[PDB]
Design a protein around this nucleic acid. Structure first.
Ligand SMILES: [Mg+2]
Ligand SMILES: [Mg+2]
Ligand SMILES: [Mg+2]
Ligand SMILES: [Mg+2]
Ligand SMILES: [Mg+2]
Ligand SMILES: [Mg+2]
Ligand SMILES: [Mg+2]
Ligand SMILES: [Mg+2]
Ligand SMILES: [Mg+2]
Ligand SMILES: [Mg+2]
Ligand SMILES: [Mg+2]
Ligand SMILES: [Zn+2]
Lengths: 36, 142, 165, 206
RNA sequence: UUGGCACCUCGAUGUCGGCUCGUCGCAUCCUGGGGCUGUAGUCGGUCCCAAGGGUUGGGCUGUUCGCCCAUUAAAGCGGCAC
RNA sequence: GAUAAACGCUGAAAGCAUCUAAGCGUGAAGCCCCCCUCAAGAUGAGAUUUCCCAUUUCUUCGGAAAGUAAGAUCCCUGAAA
């Protein structure tokens, strides 16, 4: 998981979602997991 | 001069029973504080206690808007170093609702000797049953 | 939402009971959203176009559909053990897995779910409550999830595991 | 869960069958009687009240005599409640013998520790002395009362004061021997209190 | 921290280090839980949750600091009139 | 027992997808219990068992004082304190 204030798609597969009022990107590529 | 002043045991203090079900914790508290203080009576005298006795029933069904159930924290400090204990309004509404309403109402009473006497006139019950039937309590609406 | 033969759907205030051949279900929905029960087909009604209602609408539809399809042909989640010395034994109501731990791992199915084991290498989870099937299936996969180096461990049958060196 | 009251007689040792030598405390527990059963209906909790050692009439009063008359027994020196017991066992006036325990039973011994009177921080709280030489004028003192900022001393600054005479529970003592005709328990190791001290022996909570 | 300012104290607010006694913060040294890994395993790296408890004895120097010896699960960093 | 990070299940909003919006579960030496001790001046002064009983003269009145009960103390011998 990358935890950082700048969360943004790293590839085309990256999807930006919101869980519990937290922006995050989920992706097939586990390196691209990000939470804000 | 001539302005009326209530004497102790002059004004008839009545017993009221109030259903807490679905009412915001405040809103219920603020109305009850006024009844306890005697603000609803024209005999109101600031130094005497002319107010009524209040039984609150169904305190377990008291309303907490927003995320207050999880996010409203009640703190206690023992006065020992690092002796700060915390409870959520939610947990306290489940386990000790009599405590929750007493805290809420205590905060809205005068912070003095008479204020401490007023608090003694408040009886809170989690359920629908009190044991003050002898005092012939009359239902009160908010 | 079409009701198949054998199914009877009833509504009591907000809650809706569904009793069929495979089993019997009870699920409580949000009140303001209303459901119109007819002998053949089920049409769920939305009063206002507020974000809350738009969401609940699709959910009440989806869950009711799942409930009805639940009690008809039933739900089946299939699992597949990979790796040398990975096996599953069915003894009584207990699913006993040997997945490489020093101890054996055992699962007792809840009320309304079955864990019949055709071959030692694979497991199948039958039930009518899809979420109860999903959870038990996940809980069994949770014991040894698939690792990325040789693909060993408990995987879903259709699952696609990422692989490394 | 079983319980009894005895007096600490003293300590000795016994050789085990193995050949090992273990220290034991001898608890004499004669004249335990069941005086009263407390129920949830009556008192709001389950407990059996046991009266221990017989006491001369003139040392009792009419309140006491009335209480033990309900159990057809003489006044009792020590009365204690046991909770977590099975009330189906215990009849009012029934003797409670040491054979409620067996060799190997793990018990918790509760008693009042020996009185040491007024004691300093070194003995009472195991604090360190200051240096004894190199110009030191600090030896058996309590240390700084605390920082400056909170113009006051915090509430657990350990200081001199009365030391022992506190209730203590030692957990998980093995019963080594049970002698019925002598009303004696042998408990491996030591239990709180001076000789003749009341000791409450009950089944280990753990 | 190194500083700037000169607002309390010059009819006195004792100033470094150590000792004793701690207590608090968490930006966590160890132990617990977890995500990613250029994670085969054993070791690690990095980030997230976590402050419950724990967090050594010596040589040198007034020292703090630091280097060193030998350990340790670890030898945390800070505040409290340094 | 309830949670953190986290992992999920079911699941729409957004015919897909999605751990989340409704709804279920897993999940920390941490939180609350459990363990040990103090604790009803908890003036909100709680509970149980047992004991003593309704005395005398006054006080228009309310109350007052003066012998006692159960019980306790002074005093004395002491220590396990
Ligand atoms: Mg002594
Ligand atoms: Mg020392
Ligand atoms: Mg000296
Ligand atoms: Mg102050
Ligand atoms: Mg100037
Ligand atoms: Mg001066
Ligand atoms: Mg942190
Ligand atoms: Mg200083
Ligand atoms: Mg899904
Ligand atoms: Mg749990
Ligand atoms: Mg531990
Ligand atoms: Zn991506």
């Amino acid at each position: 998981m990358k935890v950082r204030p700048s969360v943004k798609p790293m590839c085309e597969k990256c999807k930006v979602i919101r869980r519990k009022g937290k922006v995050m990107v989920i992706c097939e590529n586990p390196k691209h997991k990000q939470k804000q | 001069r001539t302005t009326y002043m209530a004497k102790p045991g002059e004004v008839e203090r009545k017993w009221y029973v109030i259903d807490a079900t679905g009412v915001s914790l405040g809103r219920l508290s603020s109305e009850v504080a006024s009844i306890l203080r005697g603000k609803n009576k024209p005999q109101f005298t600031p130094h005497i206690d002319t107010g009524d006795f209040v039984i609150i029933i169904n305190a377990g069904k008291i309303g907490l808007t927003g995320k207050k159930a999880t996010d409203k924290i009640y703190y206690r400090h023992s006065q020992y170093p690092g002796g700060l204990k915390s409870r959520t309004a939610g947990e306290m509404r489940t386990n000790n609702p009599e405590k929750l309403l007493e805290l809420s109402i205590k905060g809205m009473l005068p912070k003095n000797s008479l204020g401490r006497q007023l608090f003694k006139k408040l009886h809170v019950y989690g359920g629908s049953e009190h044991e003050h039937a002898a005092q012939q309590p009359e239902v009160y609406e908010l | 939402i079409v009701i198949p033969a054998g199914v009877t759907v009833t509504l009591n205030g907000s809650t809706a009971t569904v009793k069929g051949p495979k089993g019997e279900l009870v699920k409580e929905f949000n009140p303001e959203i209303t459901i119109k029960i007819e002998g053949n087909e089920i049409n769920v009604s939305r009063p206002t176009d507020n974000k809350n209602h738009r969401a609940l609408h699709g959910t009440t539809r989806a869950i009711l559909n799942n409930m009805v399809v639940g009690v008809s042909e039933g739900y089946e989640k299939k699992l597949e053990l990979i790796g040398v010395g990975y096996r599953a034994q069915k003894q009584g109501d207990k699913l006993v897995l040997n997945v490489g731990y020093s101890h054996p791992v055992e699962f007792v199915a809840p009320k309304g779910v079955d864990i019949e084991v055709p071959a030692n290498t694979q497991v199948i989870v039958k039930g009518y409550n899809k979420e109860h099937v999903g959870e038990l299936a996940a809980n069994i996969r949770a014991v040894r999830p698939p690792e990325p180096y040789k693909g060993k461990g408990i995987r879903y049958e259709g699952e696609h595991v990422r692989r490394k060196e | 869960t079983k319980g009894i009251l005895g007096r600490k007689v003293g300590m000795t040792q016994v050789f085990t069958e193995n050949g090992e030598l273990i220290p034991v405390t001898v608890i004499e527990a004669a004249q335990n009687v069941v005086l009263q059963k407390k129920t949830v209906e009556t008192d709001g909790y389950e407990a059996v009240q046991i009266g221990f050692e017989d006491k001369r009439a003139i040392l009792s009063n009419k309140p006491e005599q009335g209480h033990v008359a309900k159990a057809n027994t003489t006044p009792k020196r020590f009365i204690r409640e046991f909770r977590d017991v099975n009330l189906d066992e215990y009849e009012i006036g029934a003797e409670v013998k040491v054979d409620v325990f067996a060799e190997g039973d793990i018990i918790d011994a509760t008693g009042v520790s020996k009185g040491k009177g007024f004691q300093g921080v070194i003995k009472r709280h195991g604090q360190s002395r200051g240096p004894m030489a190199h110009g030191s004028r600090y030896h058996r003192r309590p240390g700084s009362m605390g920082p400056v900022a909170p113009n006051r001393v915090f509430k657990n600054k350990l200081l001199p004061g009365r030391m022992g005479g506190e209730q203590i529970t030692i957990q998980n003592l093995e019963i080594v021997k049970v002698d019925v005709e002598k009303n004696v328990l042998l408990v491996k190791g030591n239990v709180p209190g001076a000789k003749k001290a009341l000791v409450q022996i009950k089944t280990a909570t753990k």
